[PDB]
Amino acid sequence: KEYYKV
Amino acid sequence: MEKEFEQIDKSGSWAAIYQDIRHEASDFPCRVAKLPKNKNRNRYRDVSPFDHSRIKLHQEDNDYINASLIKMEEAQRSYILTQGPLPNTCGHFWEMVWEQKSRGVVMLNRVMEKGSLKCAQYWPQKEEKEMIFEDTNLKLTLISEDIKSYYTVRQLELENLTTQETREILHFHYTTWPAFGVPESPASFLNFLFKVRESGSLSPEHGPVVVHASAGIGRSGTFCLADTCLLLMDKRKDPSSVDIKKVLLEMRKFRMGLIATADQLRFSYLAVIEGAKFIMGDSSVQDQWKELSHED
């Protein structure tokens, strides 16, 4: 959630 | 040039090119962004603004806003790329807008996408419920809005409670563009950009337009990358000379990770290609994109 790319 | 688009597409090597761009991309420091006091001004751990191109707030408590000033010397155009505001950086966002004398805001996300809020409700939704940001002493009123099938063109009156001054900000909201996705078609995309151009929000007479999405790197990167390339073709005396890969790397000198998917990168090519037709000439009956866009 706290990252823009996974 | 267009067939040059196929050859890369026949090989289906976009992922190769996009990873090359990712590898060759600049890597400048973001010390200010990673300061502890700014943990909560950043929506994502991994998207931060370079210290050298980051916008700064004229306020004196903290000057940090997750915003980068992309400036394109050859094309003569600048954009401010920024993350979607948070519940607590909304006053910063409009503070940034006011200080930078920006005339237009380009929104490429939606407040809610896939069951999660990517952005804040940073603009009032009803003419009768104006918004007031106490921290940055600004008041924002909705004036009028034009709704089309995939985009909305609000008209806002931002006002400085301190100087008593007021300005008209144009809001360009692309409501159908999904995260890591691509616009329904180039025709839909080009229609949008050209509406932004005519409003004069992009003209150097004003500040830089503010363009954003959930993180302001992926969809926004495609927007400017399309805009800047087209801007060049009318200028260089050999519109074929524009290298879309070269331009994207140049922007990545001001904000990290512009363009988020090999697909987004691919669409960026098509939009320039389809848009080059307008710049190039576009037959003996332009205005076509207006018809094909399916606005309403």
Numbering used by the authors:
A (entry chain E): 1160 to 1165
B (entry chain A): 3 to 298
From the paper:
Although our structural and biochemical data show that PTP1B exhibits a preference for dephosphorylation of the second pTyr of JAK2, it is clear that both pTyr residues can be dephosphorylated. In order to observe the first pTyr in the active site, we solved structures of PTP1B (D181A/Q262A/C215A) bound to a substrate peptide in which only the first or second tyrosine was phosphorylated (ie. pYY or YpY) to 2.34 and 3.09 Å resolution respectively. These structures confirmed that either phosphotyrosine can occupy the catalytic pocket. For both monophosphorylated peptides, the phosphorylated tyrosine occupies the catalytic pocket. Three copies of the PTP1B:YpY peptide complex are present in the asymmetric unit, however one was not fully resolvable.
